[PDB]
Structure 1
Amino acid sequence: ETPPRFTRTPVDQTGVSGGVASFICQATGDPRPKIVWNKKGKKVSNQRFEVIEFDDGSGSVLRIQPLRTPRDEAIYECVASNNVGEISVSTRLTVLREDQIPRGFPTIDMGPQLKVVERTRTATMLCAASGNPDPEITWFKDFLPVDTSNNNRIKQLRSRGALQIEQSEESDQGKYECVATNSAGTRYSAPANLYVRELREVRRVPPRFSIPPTNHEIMPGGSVNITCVAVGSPMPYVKWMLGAEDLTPEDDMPIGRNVLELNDVRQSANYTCVAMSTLGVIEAIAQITVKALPKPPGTPVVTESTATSITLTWDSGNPEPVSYYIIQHKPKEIDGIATTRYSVAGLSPYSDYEFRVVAVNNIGRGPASEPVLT
């Protein structure tokens, strides 16, 4: 047999009233040291004081909740005793009131929120703190300290002292508390239950345009509904952009189907349809071009002229291709001229005529050009 030896002794912690304070104590020996907590040589009795036995059975944790002052301001001792021997160590407890909080006391900037992760997945309990000096972060699962000494599953992150739990399991379910501590004192955070569920097995498929944005051609100041549909699991958030600017406030974003309702289109421009999920970002372009009225063609010039016929030639006078032209003539309009040249026949000998040319496209009929005498 061997008399008990303290491998780690409890330290003097300064907690705040209305909060929680926990003390750790564990030792080794043969047989295993049965640890009992005492106050002024008296075992704890009050309901607010609770002792939690370790999984090893080689130690115990005394949790005090809630903290009060100066009702709980006293000195406590940890007694590890077995058949061969008995040892004990004392520690001081300081409980500061809410109006006694010093300037620079640990403050929970961000406490752990409720989280749920499936089996064999990464869990990340978050926490943050501030004060003078910078407090370090310790975690408490099920009123017990988490063993994050060295890189063994459960690791504390180097500086944001989160609790990255890789390869989650059944035993990981419990109440996770966050604790900040410096030279000023110790502050606990709000509890957060962690639950682990079975594997869901969902097919993860990147975003894909089911119905791509079709091109369109609209008259000046013409409203138009362009539609864009994307599918996949998970469903992507479809939006619209003018390259630099966006239309939707991103607060109300539809799933799978987005219909952009445009209005008063004055100038041709490209609209971008973007769908985005957790599996990447895809893009698509919708063509909105404005078709306008034809400009007046070039002034018709009499290239050939006979007794009963006069030939007209002219320039298109348009950047866009022209379907056909309409020749006006009088001392009556000639429709259906697919070329830029036409011979007006059936005229009187020795007679002066006036000729105009009009361009017509898919939109409609443009203005008449400047006339020509002959």
Structure 2
Amino acid sequence: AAHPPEIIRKPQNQGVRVGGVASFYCAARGDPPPSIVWRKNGKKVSGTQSRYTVLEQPGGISILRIEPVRAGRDDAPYECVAENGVGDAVSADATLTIYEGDKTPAGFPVITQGPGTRVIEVGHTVLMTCKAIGNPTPNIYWIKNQTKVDMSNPRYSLKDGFLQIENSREEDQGKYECVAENSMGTEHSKATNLYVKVR
């Protein structure tokens, strides 16, 4: 195992509404595997700071989540850094544009309807609703517990931007949200819980 760190996914610029959620994704690889560090305006991102949380996900992914987005503070460059003790560190960065009030780019995604909390009996199927519009039309994806829902799962599909889960199992319990992603912006729905009862 002898390789220098490589960024295989760069962070992308985001536009978010104030009070919103924003996230940046980074991924890298090397031999041996790099750590990824997140920087704001060149300053490593605080363990303390309540609004930022960093999620490390297998496949080499690192995610920086900012919730709730603050209009002054959060308008900055977030850079992700990868090091493994071989060669040079590799870094990539992205900006965050924050939109006050309604002064949003035309066609910024809007979520007309959002998921509601539900209890579902084991073995039953549920539909969770996201309704969105934008131009260009938003791609819609679902998150549980801040993690992308895996649509590789046989039991999970999208109907009309709705998330359907068939043959419900306890493991499906979580806090779900829907994201509508646009060239213009990203919108996250309000998180809500899915509970599974027995019997």
SS of the residue corresponding to residue 141 of structure 2 reads: strand
1:4 matched to which residue of 2? 5
Distance in 1 between residues matched to 2:78 and 2:135, nearest whole Å: 27
Q: What's the CA shift string for 1:245-300, capped at 9, x where partnerless?
A: xxxxxxxxxxxxxxxxxxxxxxxxxxxxxxxxxxxxxxxxxxxxxxxxxxxxxxxx
Aligned mates of 2:72, 2:24 — CA distance in 1: 18
What does residue 268 of structure 1 align with? none
Pick closer, same or farther for the CA change 1:120–1:26 going to 2, 3 Å: farther
1:30–1:116 distance in 2 versus 1, CA, 3 Å:
farther
Look at both structures and tell me which one has the larger radius of gyration over its CA atoms: 1
For 2:91, the aligned partner's letter is S
Q: 1:79 aligns with which of 78, 81, 101?
A: 81
Measure the CA separation in 1 of the matches of 2:121 and 2:65.
30
1:181-215: CA deviation from partner (whole Å, max 9, x where unpaired): 212211111111111222x2xxxxxxxxxxxxxxx
Residue 133 (structure 2) aligns with: 130
The one-letter code sitting in structure 2 at the alignment partner of 1:50 is T
Report the identity percentage: 52
Computed over aligned residues only, the root mean square deviation of the Cα atoms, in angstroms, reads 2.2
Question: What letter is aligned with 1:84?
Answer: V
CA distance in 1, matches of 2:120, 2:85: 45
Matched residues, number? 195
The residue identity in structure 1 corresponding to 2:169 is E
What is the Cα deviation at residue 152 of structure 1?
A: 5.5
Structure 2 residue runs without a partner (length 5+): none
How far apart in 2 are the matches of 1:26 and 1:108? Answer: 28
The corresponding residue for 2:190 is 190
**Counterpart in the other structure of 2:172:** 172
Do the aligned partners of residues 84 and 120 (structure 1) sit closer, same or farther apart at CA in structure 2, a change above 3 Å counting?
farther
Secondary structure at the counterpart of residue 133 of structure 1: coil
Quote the residue 1:342 is aligned against.
Answer: none
SS in 2 for 1:171: helix
Aligned pair in 2 of structure 1 residues 134, 12: CA closer, same or farther (>3 Å)?
A: same
The one-letter amino acid paired with 1:53 is E
After superposition, what is the alpha-carbon deviation per residue over 1:79-125, rounded to whole angstroms, capped at 9, x for unaligned?
Answer: 12223353221112111111422443211111011122233443322
- After superposition, residues 2-81 of structure 1 pair within 5 angstroms as 2-45=3-46, 46-54=49-57, 56=58, 58-81=60-83
TM-score by length of 2: 0.86
Residue equivalent to 1:300:
none
* Highest RCO, 1 vs 2 (Cα 8 Å, sep ≥ 6): 2
CA distance in 2, matches of 1:103, 1:58: 35
Deviation at 1:32, TM superposition (A): 2.9
Structure 1 residue ranges without an equivalent (≥5): 201-374
